[PDB]
């Protein structure tokens, strides 16, 4: 009959990257984690302890606990018509600071600053992002760029 073990379906998911097998470099053990940090989970199948179950591969949550060798992470998982709150104890080999929370904090600073120079000039700011806008009129010149005219091409076999 059917088979649904814990690591069922995981052959390509927990595999190591091509020409990247072996010891895990120390950077991984030098990152510091704080309650409230945002991490992305991604299994390292060379470290079998403290390992996220495969549903959580590729998912991002919040740190809620810090321990000798692991962080606890809060993931919101959808079961039925409702998210349930899940907490995971992942070892550090399987976790990584979320890079987008970093752009975000950087921008919050940038924002505070833009606000500062604006006030200490007493001017309007405009701090929120606009999306890509239509495009304004241009004049293209023809100096050195007299348009080359093209036509469709006859069918032909190359075999």
């Amino acid at each position: 009959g059917k088979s649904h073990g814990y690591r069922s379906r995981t052959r390509y998911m927990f595999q190591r990257d091509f020409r990247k097998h072996g010891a895990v470099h120390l950077s991984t053990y030098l990152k510091v984690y704080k309650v409230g940090d945002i991490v992305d989970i991604k299994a390292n199948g060379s470290i079998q302890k403290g390992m996220p179950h495969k549903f959580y591969q590729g998912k991002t949550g919040v740190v809620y606990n810090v321990t000798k060798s692991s962080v606890g992470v809060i993931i919101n998982k959808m079961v039925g018509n409702r998210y349930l709150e899940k907490r995971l104890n992942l070892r550090v080999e399987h976790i990584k600071h979320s890079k987008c929370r970093q752009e975000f904090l950087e921008r919050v600073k940038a924002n505070a600053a833009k606000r500062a120079e604006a006030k200490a000039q007493g001017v309007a700011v405009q701090l929120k992002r606009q999306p890509a806008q239509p495009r304004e009129s241009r004049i293209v010149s023809t100096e050195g760029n007299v348009p080359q005219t093209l036509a469709p091409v006859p069918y032909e076999t190359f075999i």
Partner: protein, 51 residues
């Protein structure tokens, strides 16, 4: 009690937006453009009529 359409019925046309009075009076829904002579340059016609 009854929506009247300013686009028929000049009365409510004038009620919303005066200006209409002057708009009409001065014409200007017609109104001649100025007149310039500007010619296209050689190259523009060379390539219009290219191949």
């Amino acid at each position: 009690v009854l929506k009247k359409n300013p686009l028929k019925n000049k009365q409510v046309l004038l009620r919303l937006n005066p200006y209409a009075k002057v708009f009409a009076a001065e014409k200007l829904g017609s109104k001649k453009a100025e007149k310039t002579g500007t010619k296209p340059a050689a190259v523009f016609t060379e390539t219009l009529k290219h191949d």
